[PDB]
Amino acid sequence: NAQAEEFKKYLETNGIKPKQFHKKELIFNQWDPQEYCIFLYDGITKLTSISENGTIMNLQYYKGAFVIMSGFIDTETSVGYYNLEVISEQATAYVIKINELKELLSKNLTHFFYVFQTLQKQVSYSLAKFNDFSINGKLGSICGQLLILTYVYGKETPDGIKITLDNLTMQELGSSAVSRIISKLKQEKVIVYKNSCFYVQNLDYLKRYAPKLDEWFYLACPATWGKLN
Amino acid sequence: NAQAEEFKKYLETNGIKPKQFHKKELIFNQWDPQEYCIFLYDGITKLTSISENGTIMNLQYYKGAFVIMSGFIDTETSVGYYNLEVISEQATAYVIKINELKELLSKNLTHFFYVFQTLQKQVSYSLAKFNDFSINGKLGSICGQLLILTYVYGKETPDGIKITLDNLTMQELGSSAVSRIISKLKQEKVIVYKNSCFYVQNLDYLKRYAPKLDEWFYLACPATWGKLN
Ligand SMILES: O=C(O)[C@@H]1CSc2c(C3CC3)c(Cc3cccc4ccccc34)cc(=O)n21
Ligand SMILES: O=C(O)[C@@H]1CSc2c(C3CC3)c(Cc3cccc4ccccc34)cc(=O)n21
């Protein structure tokens, strides 16, 4: 990822320091009155929300390299009250106060375009995710998440496509319908737990029920989309 | 909105003329290889997708003033295959090719920050609606749709809070489960349909089953929010 490495070197040049985090750590949480811009350089995270009675809802997953913002770039108001939690064993992130960001981007348009693009990818990603929900219900959503996991962590092997993630991360990613659906897929040999990993066979089935996410990845990450097609 | 008028002027300074469109026109369509930046200024539109078997998925609805983009500003490549379709009677929209946009934003960052912040509102908007549907099901959706109508088109009346839309537009966007929900909201007199118009008289019930959208209106459109609170 060329833009990402360039954005790292730009942040470090401007004196911004990389912070290590550990699983279950919160890079920011939903009560913080400091709005941040997080450049997640390495790791896997989830955006969660905590409702008033304390039940946790998982909203979105992110992966390095990527930008996540808790405030609006001009106002430096919260965009929404959320937590960003680390779910891989480690993660590396550059934490930037919102207003510092405005300055950093103002003085370099290339980086500004890059950050802007990361927003565009979230917007196109949620359109595609809503599309596949609209057609195939939860089946759209499970397949969609399995498909991206495969494109991003799948190693072609005679065994199929191995999803290269130690199990703890897979458990952090994953009800009635679910069990019955995840059932159906195992039953149908789309995925297999063999040799202690998931291995994916019917990539075509994933693509069928999550078509828009297939397209979205093709446009967003073409080089990666090519390696399994 | 202030930022909205000023970007309209900047666009006309740089020679972008408003193009008028009428109900059911495609502002752009998915096969068009030209990536665009649509600044919807007035009217209502919807983004749609066309799955292969030909069914038209409604993905999102938009209201002037707002920004819709069909290419990534950095690589200038397609963000997806979409159609942008008018559903109001007429709408005012400035259509800018993606390369010309990038130049316009590059020479005035104020406007760059406005467009950037517009996509940020779009990101958290869809997370908020998703939080509400995951927590409260269709009651969360329905209560979200009506909350939306209320803030944007809610004109306070003795009869309560009227929804100021020609009732063919209403009728353009609007099942078994749905009717059980509206059946109840009509019975408990949270909404009243009289004189062929919707009215709202318990704003606080809606805020209960859609607390993330309510919270989103507050952080992203405080002016609108505060008017009704
Ligand atoms: O990392 C990237 O540049 C690409 C392009 S934008 C994106 C996303 C979208 C949230 C913005 C995701 C999210 C995602 C989807 C499905 C499974 C995931 C598993 C782990 C982490 C994130 C996941 C993933 C992703 O790779 N990308
Ligand atoms: O609001 C819009 O103009 C579109 C059309 S109705 C909708 C929703 C639904 C709650 C009513 C959402 C939220 C949402 C629900 C279910 C699955 C989702 C999957 C991904 C993202 C959001 C999801 C978002 C949204 O944009 N819209």
> What are the domain boundaries of chain B?
1-108, 136-229
Q: After which residues is chain A broken (C to N over 2.5 A)?
A: 174
**Greatest pairwise CA separation for chain B in angstroms:** 56
**Nearest CB to A73; choose among B80, B106, B113:** B113
> Looking at the domain covering B1-108, what would its CATH class be?
mainly beta
Q: By C-alpha distance, which of A100, A86, A93 is closest to A29?
A: A86
Which residues does chain A have within 8 Å of residue B1's beta carbon, measured at their own beta carbons? none
Contact B127 A60 (CB under 8 A): yes
Q: Are A203 and A150 in contact (CB under 8 A)?
A: yes
Contact B124 A59 (CB under 8 A): no
Residue A148 CA, ligand 1 centroid: distance in Å: 7
Residues 114-153 of A with CB under 8 A from B: 114-117, 119-124, 126-128, 130-131, 134-135
Which residues does chain B have within 8 Å of residue A50's beta carbon, measured at their own beta carbons? none
Residue A78 CA, ligand 1 centroid: distance in Å: 22
Please state, in angstroms and rounded to a whole number, the distance separating the CA atoms of residues A119 and A98. 15
* Tokens matching residue B4: 């909205």
Pure H helices in A1-56: 2-13
* Among chain A residues, CA nearest to B210: A51
Q: By C-alpha distance, which of B30, B79, B55, B81 is closest to A136?
A: B55
Q: Which experimental method was this entry solved with?
A: X-ray
Q: Are A102 and A74 in contact (CB under 8 A)?
A: yes
Burial of A195 (0-12, 13-18, 19+ CB in 10 A): exposed
Ligand nearest to the CA of A225: 1
Amino acid at B139: L
Report CA dihedral (A181, A183, A184, A185) to the nearest 10 degrees.
90
> In sequence order, what are the residues at sequence separation of 6 or more whose Cβ sits closer than 8 angstroms to the Cβ of residue A176?
none
Q: Are A119 and B123 in contact (CB under 8 A)?
A: yes
Which residues face B21 on adjacent strands?
B91
How many CB atoms lie under 10 A from the CB of residue A169?
16
Q: Are B45 and B88 in contact (CB under 8 A)?
A: yes
Q: Are B87 and B172 in contact (CB under 8 A)?
A: yes
Contact A130 B59 (CB under 8 A): yes
Does A217 contact chain B (CB < 8 Å)? Answer: no
Q: Are A41 and A18 in contact (CB under 8 A)?
A: yes
Please state, in angstroms and rounded to a whole number, the distance separating the CA atoms of residues A131 and A113. 27
**Nearest CB to B57; choose among A57, A82, A134:** A134
Q: Do domains A1-108 and A136-229 have the same CATH topology?
A: no
* Tokens matching residue A108: 């370099």
Q: Are B138 and B144 in contact (CB under 8 A)?
A: no
Q: Are B94 and B38 in contact (CB under 8 A)?
A: yes
Name which of A114, A115, A130 to mutate to probe chain B: the one with the most chain B Cβ atoms within 10 A of its Cβ. Answer: A130
HEC-encoded secondary structure of chain B = CHHHHHHHHHHHHCCCCCEEEECCCEEECCCCCCCEEEEEEECEEEEEEECCCCCEEEEEEEECCEEEECECCCCCCECCCCEEEECCCEEEEEEEEHHHHHHHHHCCHHHHHHHHHHHHHHHHHHHHHHHHHHHHHHHHHHHHHHHHHHHHHEEEECCEEEECCCCCHHHHHCCHHHHHHHHHHHHCCCEEEECCEEEECCHHHHHHHCHHHHHHHHHHCHHHHHHCC
Count of all residues that appear for chain B in the document: 229
HEC-encoded secondary structure of A147-168 = HHHHHHHEEEECCEEEECCCHH
Q: Is the CB of B60 under 6 A from ligand 2?
A: yes
| Torsions phi, psi for B49 (to 5 deg) | -125, 160
> In sequence order, what are the residues at sequence separation of 6 or more whose Cβ sits closer than 8 angstroms to the Cβ of residue B171?
none
**Nearest CB to B80; choose among A102, A116, A128:** A128
Q: Are A101 and A16 in contact (CB under 8 A)?
A: no
Q: Half-sphere exposure of A13 toward its Cβ, with a 13 Å CA cutoff?
A: 8
Does A94 contact chain B (CB < 8 Å)? Answer: no
CATH number for the domain running over B136-229: 1.10.10.10
């290269």: which residue's tokens? A164
Please state, in angstroms and rounded to a whole number, the distance separating the CA atoms of residues B91 and B22. 7
A109-153 and B109-153 helices cross at what angle (nearest 10)? 60
Contact A72 B117 (CB under 8 A): yes
Q: Beta strands A90-97 and A18-22: pairing type? A: antiparallel
Q: Are A91 and A26 in contact (CB under 8 A)?
A: no
Alpha-carbon B120 to chain mean position: 14
Please state, in angstroms and rounded to a whole number, the distance separating the CA atoms of residues A163 and A150. 6
Give the 3-state secondary structure of residue A139.
Answer: helix
How many CB atoms lie under 10 A from the CB of residue B202?
15
Q: Is the CB of A66 under 6 A from ligand 1?
A: yes
Report CA dihedral (A149, A154, A160, A165) to the nearest 10 degrees.
-80
* Tokens matching residue B80: 């997806």
DSSP string, A199-220: EE--HHHHHHH-HHHHHHHHHH
Q: Is the CB of A36 under 6 A from ligand 1?
A: no
Please state, in angstroms and rounded to a whole number, the distance separating the CA atoms of residues A71 and A77. 5
* Extended beta strands in chain A, E state: 18-22, 26-28, 36-42, 44-50, 56-63, 66-69, 83-86, 90-97, 154-157, 160-163, 191-194, 197-200
């009428």: which residue's tokens? B22
Q: Are A94 and A16 in contact (CB under 8 A)?
A: yes
Contact A74 B215 (CB under 8 A): no
Residue A62 CA, ligand 1 centroid: distance in Å: 5
